[PDB]
Amino acid sequence: VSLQDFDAERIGLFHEDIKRKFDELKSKNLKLDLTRGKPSSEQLDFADELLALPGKGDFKAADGTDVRNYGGLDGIVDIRQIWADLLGVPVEQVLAGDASSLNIMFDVISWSYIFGNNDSVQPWSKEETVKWICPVPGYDRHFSITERFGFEMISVPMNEDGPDMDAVEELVKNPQVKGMWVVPVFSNPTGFTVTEDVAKRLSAMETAAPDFRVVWDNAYAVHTLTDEFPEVIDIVGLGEAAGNPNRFWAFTSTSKITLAGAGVSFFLTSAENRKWYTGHAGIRGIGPNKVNQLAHARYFGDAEGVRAVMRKHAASLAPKFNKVLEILDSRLAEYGVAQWTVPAGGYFISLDVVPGTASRVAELAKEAGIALTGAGSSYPLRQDPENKNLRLAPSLPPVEELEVAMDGVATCVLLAAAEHYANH
Amino acid sequence: VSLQDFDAERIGLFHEDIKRKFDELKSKNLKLDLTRGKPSSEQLDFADELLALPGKGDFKAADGTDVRNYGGLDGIVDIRQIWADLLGVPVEQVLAGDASSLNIMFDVISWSYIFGNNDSVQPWSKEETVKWICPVPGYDRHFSITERFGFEMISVPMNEDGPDMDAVEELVKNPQVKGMWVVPVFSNPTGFTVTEDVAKRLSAMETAAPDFRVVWDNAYAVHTLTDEFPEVIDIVGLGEAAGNPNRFWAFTSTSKITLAGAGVSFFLTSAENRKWYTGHAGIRGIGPNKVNQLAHARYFGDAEGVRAVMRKHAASLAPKFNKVLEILDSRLAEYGVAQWTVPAGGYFISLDVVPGTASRVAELAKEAGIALTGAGSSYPLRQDPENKNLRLAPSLPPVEELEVAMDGVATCVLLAAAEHYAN
Ligand SMILES: Cc1ncc(COP(=O)(O)O)c(CN[C@@H](CCC(=O)O)C(=O)O)c1O
Ligand SMILES: Cc1ncc(COP(=O)(O)O)c(CN)c1O
Ligand SMILES: O=C(O)CCC(=O)C(=O)O
């Protein structure tokens, strides 16, 4: 019997039962935080050597470029080739920038707004209405960019195999629709991964805008919790094979590989998109930081060296995800109140509670000293129309803290659920 | 006697002889380049240690920030404080970014275009026309930004004490005029420096646009050729004192101090302007590279450490400028065909040849295997109305290459001048 099927008296009694547990939780005086989607100090210690790279006297890229001096908008060959080898794409596809792929995403959108992109009839700023497809739950920092530009964000469901392509294929037939966000591997926060079939559909679909763009933000391209590395779909190639070569603006970075905020970002896109991008980037400045790129190339040495680092991250993160999953199972399984993802990579667990109660869960957790990301944080304009979803970030705290925190979260889920069904 | 005073016969003899020298110059099959203000490899060697910084286990800013992890839009206190001490301004003024100050200049203009700035009634995108004041000769990369945005660029002279303030103060009465570029110390390329009097005028002037900005791009703030450091006007403080606190967007960087393209940039501006900037920069991302900032703070230690580095730069650069000047003096002075700047600092010499002949000089030089910046490159849209100015960049080549290259340039100046007078 799930809580929702409890009779009026049994849910009342269940409410009194669980409230006693919530009282016990508050008497612990906790100060715990499950909101930080960032690496732990242990993980950051793995790249300690990179703080001393590339090192005295070592300042030449593989083509002879003196990385210490001005020039070159594309990034250095050394790091571009490593990433090409890692991702299994031609090196010509890869541009290496500064430490933020979000910076590049914002820029390409900004420039499409000001100038148009290379396929634009006119700049997006001339449009009365720009719409933008948002698979949900999704990444708040993506949705913030499109909200700051005033684009009308239209949500679609992020499914186990990727965005709902029936919904996307329909929405792109509207010429107001200029692009979409996706995190295609271990998606933030669902953990879901775009299948080959879904990528093919994104690559082959017809769009009403001539200048429509998919942001394929492959932020977790190698970020497994297991021994297996996920498939890297060559999405730019698929777009090329389908006759839509310019469709995909693809990104990734080293921010959760080396140093979070001081890594290297990558922008993978078609020949014509790269010329457009570097033509605008060359007015914005002289080019990206080559020294940090050489440092990175030296640290990894080759693509296998990147995978070796990713196995260390996996070994550090796995027990944290396992604790969270173990607690959710032991406390909530019998009650039918919640569903949670079981991800095999990435940085998050996505928790759906009773619809109408997510904001109350986070409020109760706060009263109990446990910080949860707010209700709607994974939705455009922070509006989850079912008030059900919560994002859990296991990476930073030690396992002992995750145990305590999640035990409390689970009590909060139950109490909120008991309040909700008792109020019917 | 100047070349213009030679009679037909004498200028014909001079022309044949300089033409022969030019032919002899081309026969050398040179491949030399005076176009880019890049530090030499000798200069870059000075920061060899920075390639190993901040070093293993050293990753906390002075306020405890772990520089290896996300967050913080302002840059770390360690580097901000050193720059504040260096420039003699309150640390609160200083924001520290990534490796390019141009990126930030681009960004603040693009955001003013898109969103408006904090003093704007509406985005500049909604204006029929945006005008922008450009002191000349000036910096090509500044002008390129405002060209790319469609802004109509209005030239004013860059004089020895700064921009022509009689002209600026008149132009700013037009509300279409939204801002201005300046390089205020050892200016690119004139070497000229804004005086306190001119700075005060810029701070007090009345503008018709409510959201007018001066870009005060102090790229050469400490970049002495003589070991005497120039005055650092606290320009943000002067705008605040005049009652126009938001007027100045000030910049500098370490690109010609440490590593060119892998240094640290700074943005100095008012409290309201910083809040506006970081508001937008926080949507563009999570914030700048804190590790490189700590590396820089470790490398310099303090303001005196920055000044020690600058003295090393001066020792490397000054004989290159001196050689250029010696060649200009010995080849050109007697002929009255050219004028050039004699800078106390910065990265360039500004050369004015016979009006109507600069593009010819650059074409002759290119035929001879010597790359010069094109005619008009220090002017908006590359339009020098007198076709007289050329910029020379002594920093990159060794003195031996400078000597060969500049002897060649002088022969080009003289041939172009001889052709002009003979026609
Ligand atoms: C006035 C000025 N401001 C900024 C810069 C560069 O600032 P950064 O963006 O912080 O590095 C400069 C320098 N210009 C040189 C660069 C050489 C190159 O080949 O790229 C030039 O173009 O010659 C100046 O002058
Ligand atoms: C999907 C996604 N994309 C981009 C980023 C940030 O990338 P960067 O640090 O290179 O800006 C993050 C950080 N969590 C993320 O989850
Ligand atoms: O920790 C931060 O400042 C934001 C990090 C973030 O967006 C993420 O890693 O998902």
Coordinates of N, CA, C and O in Angstrom, one line a residue, chain A residues 289-414:
Chain A
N289 N 44.1 31.5 -23.9 CA 45.3 31.3 -23.1 C 46.0 29.9 -23.5 O 45.6 28.8 -23.1
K290 N 47.1 30.1 -24.3 CA 47.8 28.9 -24.8 C 48.7 28.2 -23.7 O 49.1 27.0 -23.8
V291 N 49.1 28.9 -22.7 CA 50.0 28.4 -21.7 C 49.2 27.3 -20.9 O 49.7 26.2 -20.6
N292 N 48.0 27.7 -20.5 CA 47.1 26.7 -19.7 C 46.8 25.5 -20.6 O 46.7 24.3 -20.1
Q293 N 46.6 25.7 -21.9 CA 46.4 24.6 -22.9 C 47.6 23.7 -22.9 O 47.5 22.5 -22.9
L294 N 48.8 24.2 -23.0 CA 50.1 23.4 -22.9 C 50.2 22.7 -21.6 O 50.6 21.5 -21.6
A295 N 49.9 23.4 -20.5 CA 49.9 22.7 -19.2 C 49.0 21.5 -19.2 O 49.4 20.4 -18.7
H296 N 47.8 21.6 -19.7 CA 46.9 20.5 -19.8 C 47.4 19.4 -20.7 O 47.4 18.2 -20.2
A297 N 48.0 19.7 -21.9 CA 48.5 18.7 -22.8 C 49.6 17.9 -22.1 O 49.7 16.6 -22.2
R298 N 50.5 18.6 -21.4 CA 51.6 18.0 -20.6 C 51.1 17.1 -19.5 O 51.6 16.1 -19.2
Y299 N 50.0 17.5 -18.8 CA 49.5 16.8 -17.7 C 48.9 15.5 -18.2 O 49.2 14.4 -17.6
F300 N 48.1 15.5 -19.2 CA 47.5 14.3 -19.7 C 48.4 13.4 -20.6 O 48.2 12.2 -20.5
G301 N 49.2 14.0 -21.4 CA 50.0 13.4 -22.4 C 49.3 12.9 -23.6 O 49.6 13.2 -24.7
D302 N 48.2 12.1 -23.4 CA 47.4 11.6 -24.5 C 46.0 11.4 -24.0 O 45.7 11.5 -22.8
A303 N 45.1 11.0 -24.9 CA 43.7 10.6 -24.5 C 43.6 9.5 -23.4 O 42.7 9.6 -22.5
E304 N 44.5 8.5 -23.5 CA 44.4 7.4 -22.4 C 44.7 8.1 -21.1 O 44.1 7.7 -20.1
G305 N 45.6 9.1 -21.1 CA 45.9 9.8 -19.8 C 44.7 10.5 -19.3 O 44.5 10.6 -18.0
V306 N 43.8 11.1 -20.1 CA 42.6 11.6 -19.7 C 41.7 10.5 -19.1 O 41.2 10.7 -18.0
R307 N 41.5 9.4 -19.7 CA 40.7 8.3 -19.2 C 41.2 7.8 -17.8 O 40.4 7.6 -16.9
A308 N 42.5 7.8 -17.6 CA 43.2 7.4 -16.4 C 42.8 8.4 -15.3 O 42.4 8.0 -14.2
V309 N 42.8 9.7 -15.6 CA 42.3 10.6 -14.6 C 40.8 10.4 -14.3 O 40.4 10.4 -13.1
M310 N 40.0 10.1 -15.4 CA 38.6 9.9 -15.1 C 38.3 8.7 -14.2 O 37.3 8.7 -13.5
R311 N 39.1 7.7 -14.3 CA 39.0 6.5 -13.3 C 39.2 6.9 -11.9 O 38.6 6.4 -11.0
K312 N 40.1 7.9 -11.6 CA 40.3 8.4 -10.3 C 39.0 9.1 -9.8 O 38.6 9.0 -8.6
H313 N 38.5 10.0 -10.6 CA 37.2 10.7 -10.3 C 36.1 9.7 -10.0 O 35.4 9.8 -9.0
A314 N 36.0 8.6 -10.8 CA 35.0 7.6 -10.6 C 35.1 7.0 -9.3 O 34.2 6.8 -8.6
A315 N 36.4 6.6 -9.0 CA 36.6 5.9 -7.7 C 36.3 6.8 -6.5 O 35.9 6.3 -5.5
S316 N 36.5 8.1 -6.7 CA 36.2 9.1 -5.6 C 34.6 9.3 -5.5 O 34.1 9.5 -4.4
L317 N 34.0 9.4 -6.6 CA 32.5 9.7 -6.6 C 31.6 8.5 -6.4 O 30.5 8.7 -5.8
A318 N 32.0 7.3 -6.9 CA 31.1 6.2 -6.8 C 30.6 6.0 -5.3 O 29.4 5.8 -5.2
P319 N 31.4 6.0 -4.3 CA 30.8 5.7 -3.0 C 29.8 6.7 -2.5 O 28.9 6.4 -1.7
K320 N 29.9 8.0 -3.0 CA 29.0 9.0 -2.6 C 27.6 8.8 -3.3 O 26.6 9.0 -2.6
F321 N 27.6 8.6 -4.6 CA 26.4 8.2 -5.2 C 25.8 6.9 -4.6 O 24.6 6.9 -4.3
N322 N 26.6 6.0 -4.3 CA 26.1 4.7 -3.7 C 25.4 5.0 -2.3 O 24.3 4.4 -2.1
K323 N 26.0 5.8 -1.5 CA 25.4 6.1 -0.2 C 24.0 6.8 -0.4 O 23.1 6.4 0.3
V324 N 23.9 7.7 -1.3 CA 22.7 8.5 -1.5 C 21.6 7.5 -2.0 O 20.4 7.6 -1.5
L325 N 21.9 6.7 -3.0 CA 21.0 5.7 -3.5 C 20.6 4.6 -2.5 O 19.3 4.3 -2.4
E326 N 21.5 4.1 -1.7 CA 21.3 3.2 -0.6 C 20.3 3.8 0.5 O 19.4 3.1 0.8
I327 N 20.4 5.0 0.8 CA 19.5 5.7 1.8 C 18.1 6.0 1.2 O 17.1 5.7 1.9
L328 N 18.0 6.4 0.0 CA 16.8 6.6 -0.7 C 16.0 5.3 -0.7 O 14.8 5.3 -0.4
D329 N 16.7 4.2 -1.1 CA 16.1 2.9 -1.1 C 15.6 2.4 0.3 O 14.4 2.2 0.4
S330 N 16.4 2.4 1.3 CA 16.1 2.0 2.6 C 14.9 2.8 3.2 O 14.1 2.2 3.9
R331 N 14.9 4.1 3.1 CA 13.9 4.9 3.7 C 12.6 5.1 2.9 O 11.5 5.2 3.5
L332 N 12.6 5.1 1.6 CA 11.5 5.5 0.8 C 10.8 4.4 0.0 O 9.7 4.5 -0.4
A333 N 11.5 3.3 -0.3 CA 11.1 2.3 -1.2 C 9.7 1.7 -1.0 O 8.8 1.6 -1.9
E334 N 9.4 1.4 0.2 CA 8.1 0.8 0.6 C 6.9 1.7 0.5 O 5.7 1.3 0.4
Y335 N 7.1 3.1 0.4 CA 6.0 4.0 0.5 C 5.4 4.5 -0.9 O 4.4 5.1 -0.9
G336 N 6.1 4.4 -2.0 CA 5.5 4.8 -3.3 C 5.4 6.3 -3.4 O 4.5 6.8 -4.0
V337 N 6.3 7.1 -2.7 CA 6.2 8.5 -2.7 C 7.1 9.2 -3.7 O 6.9 10.4 -4.0
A338 N 8.2 8.6 -4.1 CA 9.3 9.2 -4.8 C 9.9 8.3 -5.8 O 10.0 7.0 -5.7
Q339 N 10.4 8.9 -6.9 CA 11.2 8.2 -7.9 C 12.5 8.9 -8.0 O 12.5 10.1 -8.0
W340 N 13.6 8.2 -8.2 CA 14.9 8.8 -8.4 C 15.6 8.1 -9.5 O 15.4 6.9 -9.8
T341 N 16.5 8.9 -10.2 CA 17.4 8.3 -11.1 C 18.5 7.5 -10.5 O 18.9 7.7 -9.4
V342 N 19.0 6.6 -11.3 CA 20.1 5.8 -10.9 C 21.2 6.0 -12.0 O 21.3 5.2 -12.9
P343 N 22.0 7.0 -11.9 CA 22.9 7.5 -13.0 C 24.2 6.6 -13.0 O 24.5 6.1 -12.0
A344 N 24.8 6.5 -14.2 CA 26.1 5.7 -14.3 C 27.2 6.6 -14.6 O 28.3 6.2 -14.9
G345 N 27.0 8.0 -14.4 CA 27.9 9.0 -14.7 C 27.3 10.4 -14.4 O 26.1 10.5 -14.0
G346 N 28.1 11.4 -14.6 CA 27.7 12.8 -14.3 C 27.8 13.1 -12.8 O 28.5 12.5 -12.0
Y347 N 27.1 14.2 -12.4 CA 27.3 14.8 -11.1 C 26.1 14.9 -10.2 O 26.1 15.4 -9.2
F348 N 24.9 14.3 -10.7 CA 23.7 14.5 -10.0 C 22.8 13.3 -9.9 O 22.9 12.4 -10.8
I349 N 21.9 13.3 -8.9 CA 20.8 12.4 -8.9 C 19.5 13.3 -8.9 O 19.5 14.4 -8.3
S350 N 18.6 12.9 -9.7 CA 17.3 13.7 -9.9 C 16.2 13.0 -9.1 O 16.0 11.8 -9.3
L351 N 15.6 13.7 -8.2 CA 14.6 13.1 -7.2 C 13.2 13.7 -7.5 O 13.1 15.0 -7.4
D352 N 12.2 12.9 -7.8 CA 10.8 13.4 -8.0 C 10.0 13.0 -6.8 O 10.0 11.8 -6.4
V353 N 9.4 13.9 -6.1 CA 8.6 13.6 -4.9 C 7.2 13.7 -5.2 O 6.8 13.9 -6.4
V354 N 6.3 13.7 -4.2 CA 4.9 13.8 -4.5 C 4.6 15.2 -5.2 O 5.1 16.2 -4.7
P355 N 3.9 15.2 -6.4 CA 3.6 16.4 -7.1 C 2.9 17.4 -6.2 O 1.9 17.0 -5.5
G356 N 3.3 18.6 -6.1 CA 2.8 19.6 -5.2 C 3.6 19.8 -4.0 O 3.3 20.6 -3.2
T357 N 4.6 19.0 -3.7 CA 5.4 19.0 -2.4 C 6.9 19.3 -2.5 O 7.5 19.4 -1.4
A358 N 7.5 19.5 -3.7 CA 8.9 19.7 -3.7 C 9.4 21.0 -3.0 O 10.4 20.9 -2.2
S359 N 8.6 22.1 -3.1 CA 8.9 23.3 -2.4 C 8.8 23.0 -0.9 O 9.7 23.5 -0.1
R360 N 7.9 22.2 -0.4 CA 7.7 21.9 1.0 C 8.9 21.0 1.5 O 9.4 21.2 2.6
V361 N 9.3 20.1 0.7 CA 10.5 19.2 1.0 C 11.7 20.1 1.3 O 12.4 19.9 2.2
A362 N 12.0 21.0 0.4 CA 13.1 21.9 0.5 C 13.0 22.8 1.7 O 13.9 23.1 2.4
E363 N 11.8 23.3 2.0 CA 11.5 24.1 3.2 C 11.8 23.3 4.5 O 12.5 23.8 5.4
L364 N 11.2 22.1 4.5 CA 11.5 21.2 5.7 C 12.9 20.9 5.9 O 13.5 20.9 7.0
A365 N 13.6 20.6 4.8 CA 15.0 20.3 4.9 C 15.8 21.5 5.4 O 16.7 21.4 6.3
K366 N 15.4 22.7 4.9 CA 16.1 23.9 5.5 C 15.8 24.1 7.0 O 16.8 24.4 7.8
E367 N 14.6 23.9 7.5 CA 14.3 23.9 8.9 C 15.1 22.9 9.7 O 15.5 23.2 10.9
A368 N 15.5 21.8 9.1 CA 16.3 20.8 9.7 C 17.8 21.0 9.4 O 18.6 20.1 9.6
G369 N 18.3 22.1 8.9 CA 19.7 22.4 8.6 C 20.3 21.7 7.4 O 21.5 21.6 7.3
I370 N 19.5 21.3 6.4 CA 20.0 20.6 5.2 C 19.6 21.5 4.0 O 18.4 21.7 3.8
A371 N 20.6 22.0 3.3 CA 20.3 22.8 2.1 C 20.2 22.0 0.9 O 21.1 21.2 0.5
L372 N 19.0 22.1 0.2 CA 18.7 21.5 -1.0 C 18.5 22.6 -2.1 O 18.1 23.7 -1.7
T373 N 18.8 22.3 -3.3 CA 18.6 23.2 -4.4 C 17.1 23.5 -4.4 O 16.3 22.5 -4.2
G374 N 16.6 24.7 -4.6 CA 15.2 24.9 -4.5 C 14.3 24.2 -5.6 O 14.8 23.8 -6.7
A375 N 13.1 24.0 -5.3 CA 12.0 23.5 -6.3 C 12.0 24.4 -7.6 O 12.1 25.6 -7.5
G376 N 11.9 23.7 -8.7 CA 12.0 24.5 -10.0 C 13.4 24.9 -10.5 O 13.6 25.3 -11.6
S377 N 14.5 24.6 -9.7 CA 15.8 25.1 -10.1 C 16.3 24.5 -11.4 O 17.1 25.1 -12.1
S378 N 15.8 23.3 -11.7 CA 16.2 22.6 -13.0 C 15.2 22.9 -14.2 O 15.2 22.2 -15.2
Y379 N 14.5 24.0 -14.1 CA 13.4 24.4 -15.0 C 13.5 25.8 -15.5 O 14.0 26.6 -14.7
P380 N 13.1 26.1 -16.7 CA 13.2 27.5 -17.1 C 12.4 28.4 -16.2 O 11.3 28.0 -15.8
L381 N 12.9 29.6 -15.9 CA 12.4 30.6 -15.0 C 12.1 30.0 -13.6 O 11.3 30.6 -12.9
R382 N 12.8 28.9 -13.3 CA 12.5 28.2 -12.0 C 11.1 27.8 -11.7 O 10.6 27.8 -10.6
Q383 N 10.3 27.3 -12.8 CA 8.9 27.0 -12.7 C 8.8 25.5 -13.2 O 8.8 25.2 -14.3
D384 N 8.7 24.6 -12.2 CA 8.4 23.2 -12.5 C 6.9 23.2 -12.3 O 6.4 23.4 -11.2
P385 N 6.1 22.9 -13.4 CA 4.7 23.0 -13.3 C 4.0 21.9 -12.4 O 2.9 22.0 -12.0
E386 N 4.8 20.8 -12.0 CA 4.3 19.8 -11.1 C 4.8 20.0 -9.7 O 4.4 19.2 -8.8
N387 N 5.7 20.9 -9.5 CA 6.3 21.1 -8.1 C 6.7 19.7 -7.5 O 6.2 19.3 -6.5
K388 N 7.5 19.0 -8.3 CA 7.9 17.6 -7.9 C 9.4 17.3 -7.8 O 9.8 16.4 -7.1
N389 N 10.2 18.1 -8.6 CA 11.5 17.7 -8.9 C 12.5 18.3 -7.9 O 12.4 19.5 -7.6
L390 N 13.5 17.6 -7.4 CA 14.6 18.1 -6.7 C 15.9 17.5 -7.2 O 15.9 16.4 -7.6
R391 N 16.9 18.4 -7.3 CA 18.3 18.0 -7.7 C 19.1 17.6 -6.5 O 19.2 18.4 -5.5
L392 N 19.8 16.5 -6.5 CA 20.8 16.1 -5.4 C 22.2 16.1 -6.0 O 22.5 15.5 -7.1
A393 N 23.2 16.7 -5.3 CA 24.5 16.9 -5.7 C 25.4 16.1 -4.7 O 25.8 16.6 -3.7
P394 N 25.8 14.8 -5.0 CA 26.6 14.1 -4.1 C 28.1 14.3 -4.0 O 28.8 13.7 -3.1
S395 N 28.7 15.0 -5.0 CA 30.1 15.0 -5.2 C 31.0 15.7 -4.0 O 32.1 15.2 -3.8
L396 N 30.5 16.7 -3.4 CA 31.5 17.4 -2.6 C 31.6 16.8 -1.1 O 32.7 16.6 -0.7
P397 N 30.5 16.6 -0.5 CA 30.7 16.1 1.0 C 31.3 14.7 1.1 O 31.1 13.9 0.3
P398 N 31.9 14.5 2.3 CA 32.2 13.1 2.6 C 31.0 12.2 2.8 O 29.9 12.7 3.0
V399 N 31.2 10.9 2.7 CA 30.1 9.9 2.7 C 29.3 9.9 4.0 O 28.1 9.8 4.0
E400 N 30.0 10.1 5.1 CA 29.4 10.2 6.4 C 28.3 11.3 6.5 O 27.2 11.2 7.0
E401 N 28.6 12.5 5.8 CA 27.7 13.6 5.8 C 26.5 13.4 4.8 O 25.4 13.8 5.1
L402 N 26.8 12.7 3.7 CA 25.7 12.3 2.8 C 24.8 11.3 3.4 O 23.6 11.5 3.2
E403 N 25.3 10.4 4.2 CA 24.4 9.5 5.0 C 23.4 10.2 5.8 O 22.2 10.1 5.6
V404 N 23.9 11.2 6.6 CA 23.1 11.9 7.6 C 22.1 12.8 6.8 O 20.9 12.9 7.2
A405 N 22.6 13.6 5.9 CA 21.9 14.5 5.1 C 20.7 13.7 4.4 O 19.6 14.2 4.5
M406 N 21.0 12.7 3.7 CA 20.0 12.0 2.9 C 18.9 11.3 3.8 O 17.7 11.2 3.5
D407 N 19.3 10.8 5.0 CA 18.4 10.2 5.9 C 17.4 11.3 6.3 O 16.2 11.0 6.3
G408 N 17.9 12.6 6.5 CA 17.0 13.7 6.8 C 16.1 14.1 5.6 O 14.9 14.4 5.8
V409 N 16.7 14.1 4.4 CA 15.9 14.4 3.2 C 14.8 13.4 3.1 O 13.7 13.9 2.9
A410 N 15.1 12.2 3.3 CA 14.0 11.1 3.2 C 12.8 11.3 4.2 O 11.7 11.3 3.8
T411 N 13.2 11.7 5.4 CA 12.2 12.1 6.4 C 11.3 13.3 5.9 O 10.1 13.3 6.1
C412 N 12.0 14.2 5.3 CA 11.3 15.4 4.8 C 10.3 15.1 3.6 O 9.2 15.6 3.6
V413 N 10.8 14.2 2.8 CA 9.9 13.7 1.6 C 8.7 13.1 2.2 O 7.6 13.3 1.8
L414 N 8.9 12.2 3.3 CA 7.7 11.5 3.9 C 6.7 12.4 4.6 O 5.5 12.2 4.5

